[PDB]
Structure formats: structure tokens, C-alpha cells
RNA sequence: UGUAAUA
């Protein structure tokens, strides 16, 4: 029926929003002899409806398919048409597919810069950017930008994150937490810093959040942050370290934090200033865990923190002055655990603790 | 004995 019609006589808008018309057009695009011509005819007729098709249940398939065939000039004009609408497109079920494919097949920087302009405050508010980051459909467009574009383009993402308390809105959200991690994994160091300042400022709102705890831990894996983050975290948490060790989500961060102190000092046998404060903080921690040993060994979450501190496998090579202050105050904590060991017979993890006191002796 | 991620 439609196959018997000359391409020049096709009603491309009509076909584009139809499942079979759109599929017919796609197959025509995959047909080398007719690919170029069907593209150029289709293009001129559908260009006033670029936004419409991008959002269309079937049209979004055509737009995507077209991205593999459009000239640079054709794709540029397409982006010039719809860049102000990037918010609307990104939250859209079908629009998100179209935009990802467009972003994924940019030909040059002129096209990239247009998209970025769309995400700037001239067309998309900070609040809207935040919405996209947490949105079911939008977070995929943000991730696309994050993995396709140079970090020199990340301005609009950064601005939205550091705005007031948006670090909480983003970090404590199922989707935003993921995006932020993707961002941090590719960010420039100076961008990581700007976000880190905001994370530390709102640490209590993140440290024990179901998703926020993951952000803190992620930050702890970035080595270029050691020179300040270890002291910063601990100075903001020390007075409530026992509390945080006894909470579901923050207990993992304390464990992560403690293992990092061990890994840094052991590896010394990483820059020098870090080693200095790490030694100091570790000792203070043992003091804190010693004082509160009554609660930590008894807590449903705290015992994990304690066990991490006590595990000799973490600190074998530590067995100048510090290597003797540790051996004293951790050895002292070891014997103190023994005294309480009978007072927790009923618990499921007594034998796990008993093995650690046992493995202490074998290397002592 | 304890946490996440389109026909």
C-alpha cells in the first residue's frame, strides 16, 4: 500500500506518529539505496514538529533512529529547535529516550553547547535541575551528560547541588544518590571540593540516611580528599561517634572510616600530613570505643564497629611512638572485651568476638 | 546479628 508510493509523496508527519508508519520509515532509513533521500524528505516535513515527535510514543523511535543518519547540519538544527525544552523532554517517558540518543550522538561542540544552554538557568531553573536528578526519567539524561560531556560543561549540575540544602534533597533520594556518585566519579577535583563542602555542612542529614550514608562512604574512597576529609569528618562526628556506631546506616560509615585509618597507617610501612592526623584520630577512636565498650559490644549495630576495630588482620604490621601507643590501647581494649565476653553469652555474635581476641594472641 | 540504585 504505502510501499507502492513514491517517497516524495509520503505524508511523513502522519507516518511518524503511527507505529507502522514509523517502523516503515525506520526500515527505509536502514535501506542504503533510499536512506539519504527518505531522510532528507522526512526531515523537511517533520522539523516543525521536532518536539512533538520527541515526546511521541512512536515518534520518539523515529527521532532516535534518525540520529544515526542525520548530517551535522541536520542534527544541529534539530538541537537548536528543542534545546529550550530539555526539562519537559527529560521528565517525559518517551522524551528521555530521544534526548539520551541525541546526546549520545552529538557531532560537535556547537551541538553540545546548545544542549548545555538548555539546562542553564535561562531555560531551566535550579529547582528543575534538582527535579531531573531525582526523576525516574530525567536522571538518565543527567547521567548521559555526565558520561558524554567534558566536566567543563557540568556547571548547571554543580550549581543545583551546592544551592542551599539541595545536597540533602539529592543525596537522600533513591535516584539522586546514584547520579551524584556518577558525577563524583568523573568530576574535576575542584568540583568535588565544592560538593564536599556542602556534604560536610549537612553531614548529620546524610550520615545515617538510607542513601546518604553511601555518599559519605564514596567520598572516603577518593584519595585526593584524605588531606582534609578525615579530620573534617571526625571533628564533626567525634562527640557522637558512639551514637553513629549504633545506628543502622551510619554504622557502615564508621566501619569504612576506621578501615581507612588502618589502611593509611599500614601502607606507610600516601602523603605525610595524612599519616599524622590519622594516627591521632585512630587513637582517639580506641579511647571512645573503650569508654563506651559496654554499649558497643551489646548493640545490634555497634558490635560490627567494635569487631572492625579489633580485627588484627586490619593492623598486623602495627604490632614510632604511635606503634607502641596503639599496641597498648588496643591491647588494653582486647582484655576489656574478654571481661565482658561472658556478659553476652546469649548473643549470636559472641563467638565472632571470641575468635578475634583469640587471633589477637596468636600474633602477640 | 546490619543498608540502595518505552513499539
UniProtKB/Swiss-Prot annotation:
Domain of life: Eukaryota
Pumilio repeats by residue range: 6-44, 45-80, 81-117, 122-159, 160-197, 198-235, 236-269, 287-319
Other notes: Present with 1240 molecules/cell in log phase SD medium.
Organism from which the protein derives: Saccharomyces cerevisiae (strain ATCC 204508 / S288c) (Baker's yeast)
Signal peptide (from-to): none
Stretch of the intact protein here: 204 to 599 of 859
Function: RNA-binding protein involved in post-transcriptional regulation. Negatively regulates expression of HO by binding to the 3'-UTR of HO mRNA. Predominantly binds to mRNAs encoding chromatin modifiers and spindle pole body components. Recognizes and binds to 5'-TGTAA[CT]A[AT]TA-3' in the 3'-UTR of target mRNAs. Multicopy suppressor of POP2 mutation. Required for high temperature growth.
UniProt-annotated location(s): Cytoplasm
Upper classification of the organism: Eukaryota, Fungi, Dikarya, Ascomycota, Saccharomycotina
Start and end residues of each PUM-HD domain: 1-361
Name used for this protein in its record: Suppressor protein MPT5
Amino acid at each position: 500500500e504505502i510501499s507502492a508510493l513514491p517517497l516524495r509523496d509520503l505524508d511523513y508527519i502522519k507516518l511518524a506518529t503511527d507505529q507502522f508508519g514509523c517502523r516503515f520509515l525506520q526500515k527505509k532509513l536502514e535501506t542504503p539505496s533510499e536512506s539519504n533521500m527518505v531522510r532528507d524528505l522526512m526531515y523537511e516535513q517533520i522539523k516543525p514538529f521536532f518536539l512533538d515527535l520527541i515526546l511521541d510514543p512512536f515518534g520518539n523511535y523515529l527521532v532516535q533512529k534518525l540520529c544515526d543518519y542525520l548530517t551535522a547540519e541536520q542534527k544541529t538544527l534539530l538541537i537548536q529547535t528543542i534545546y529550550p525544552n530539555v526539562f519537559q523532554i527529560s521528565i517525559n517517558q518517551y522524551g528521555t529516550r530521544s534526548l539520551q540518543k541525541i546526546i549520545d550522538t552529538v557531532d560537535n561542540e556547537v551541538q553540545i553547547d546548545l544542549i548545555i544552554k538548555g539546562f542553564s538557568q535561562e531555560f531551566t531553573s535550579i529547582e528543575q535541575v534538582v527535579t531531573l536528578i531525582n526523576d525516574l526519567n530525567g536522571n538518565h539524561v543527567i547521567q548521559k551528560c555526565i558520561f558524554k560531556f567534558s566536566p567543563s560543561k557540568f556547571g548547571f549540575i554543580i550549581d543545583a547541588i551546592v544551592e542551599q540544602n539541595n545536597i540533602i534533597t539529592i543525596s537522600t533520594h533513591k535516584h539522586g544518590c546514584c547520579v551524584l556518585q556518577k558525577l563524583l566519579s568523573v568530576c574535576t577535583l575542584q568540583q568535588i571540593f565544592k560538593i564536599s563542602v556542602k556534604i560536610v555542612q549537612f553531614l548529620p542529614g546524610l550520615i545515617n540516611d538510607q542513601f546518604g550514608n553511601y555518599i559519605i562512604q564514596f567520598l572516603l574512597d577518593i584519595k585526593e580528599l584524605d588531606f582534609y576529609l578525615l579530620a573534617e569528618l571526625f571533628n564533626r562526628l567525634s562527640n557522637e561517634l558512639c551514637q553513629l556506631s549504633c545506628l543502622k546506616f551510619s554504622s557502615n560509615v564508621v566501619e569504612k572510616f576506621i578501615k581507612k585509618l588502618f589502611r593509611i597507617i599500614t601502607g606507610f610501612i600516601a602523603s605525610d600530613d595524612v599519616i599524622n592526623a590519622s594516627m591521632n584520630i585512630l587513637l582517639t577512636t580506641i579511647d571512645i570505643f573503650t569508654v563506651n565498650l559496654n554499649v558497643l559490644i551489646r548493640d545490634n549495630f555497634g558490635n560490627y564497629a567494635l569487631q572492625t576495630l579489633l580485627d588484627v588482620k586490619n593492623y598486623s604490621p602495627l604490632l614510632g611512638n604511635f606503634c607502641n601507643d596503639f599496641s597498648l590501647k588496643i591491647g588494653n581494649l582486647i582484655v576489656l572485651t574478654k571481661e565482658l565476653l561472658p556478659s553476652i553469652k546469649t548473643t549470636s555474635y559472641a563467638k565472632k568476638i571470641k575468635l578475634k581476641v583469640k587471633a589477637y594472641a596468636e600474633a602477640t
